[PDB]
Structure 1
Amino acid sequence: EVEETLKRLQSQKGVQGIIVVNTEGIPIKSTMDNPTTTQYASLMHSFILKARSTVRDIDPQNDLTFLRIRSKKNEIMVAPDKDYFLIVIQNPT
């Protein structure tokens, strides 16, 4: 399913915007607008590829299955396994 998944992931905290990204970056889906979704998701994909390289540097068999950034102004969530790259925009709290 698609719509039910997005609805349940959004309504759990009233998330500002989430799209499903089953491909390596460059997603065509949108939740508030095309640019802020697509370009930022591609940048997230690049940075999580770098983070995967970082976690493989210490030991190659390690993989990053969970990642969250909670700064003073936003919270970003992504749980990549092989191609499932999640995006969450949320207040820091």
Structure 2
Amino acid sequence: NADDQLKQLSALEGANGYVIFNESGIPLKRHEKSISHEKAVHIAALVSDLWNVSKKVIQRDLKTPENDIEVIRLRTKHSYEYIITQSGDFTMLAIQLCGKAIEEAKKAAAAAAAAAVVQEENKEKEKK
């Protein structure tokens, strides 16, 4: 059941990886494409500092009572997108790409497949 959500996140177009953070900062589950645990430990520390600072800043720095940030989306260079949503005590980071980025990724995958096929052909030739 829980495993299916990770598969569902991958299924959505423009999604690269999903990282989930506990209140302590331990990464519950991360995507296989992205680095597992080492990247999660590095991503969880940065998001907690950002989410905590933003949550604290909105309440006091903006002088607005009972105002809480719900979703933070950071758009950077190339196709990077990092939507952050907090549910209960768990906050996760999702990395999605634009249409051009997705096309580039598909092209790269195709190239990799072609390379693998070429290697297989070479192996067959060597066997012959």
Q: Is the 8 A contact 1:30 1:38 kept in 2?
A: no
Q: Do the aligned partners of 1:76 and 1:90 also contact (CA within 8 Å) in 2?
A: yes
2:7 match = 7
Taking the TM superposition and a 5 Å limit, the aligned residue runs for 1:29-68 are: 29-31=29-31, 32-33=34-35, 34-57=37-60, 58-68=63-73
For the residues of structure 2 that align with 1:28 and 1:81, how far apart are their CA atoms? 13
- Aligned-residue sequence identity (percent) comes to 24
Q: Check if 1:69 corresponds to 2:74.
A: yes
Question: What value does the CA root-mean-square deviation take over the aligned residues?
Answer: 2.0
2: CA distance between counterparts of 1:82 and 1:56? 19
TM-score, structure 1 normalization: 0.80
Structure 2 stretches of 5 or more lacking a match? 100-128
SS of the residue aligned with 1:52?
helix
1:29-82 per-residue CA deviation (whole Å, 9 max, x = no partner) reads 332322112211221111110000111122231111111111123110111244
Larger Rg: 2
Per chain length, whose mean CA-contact separation is higher, i.e. which structure has more relative contact order (CA < 8 Å, sep 6+)?
Answer: 1
User: Structure 2-normalised TM-score?
Assistant: 0.61
CA distance in 1, matches of 2:3, 2:20: 10
Count of aligned residue pairs for this structure pair: 92
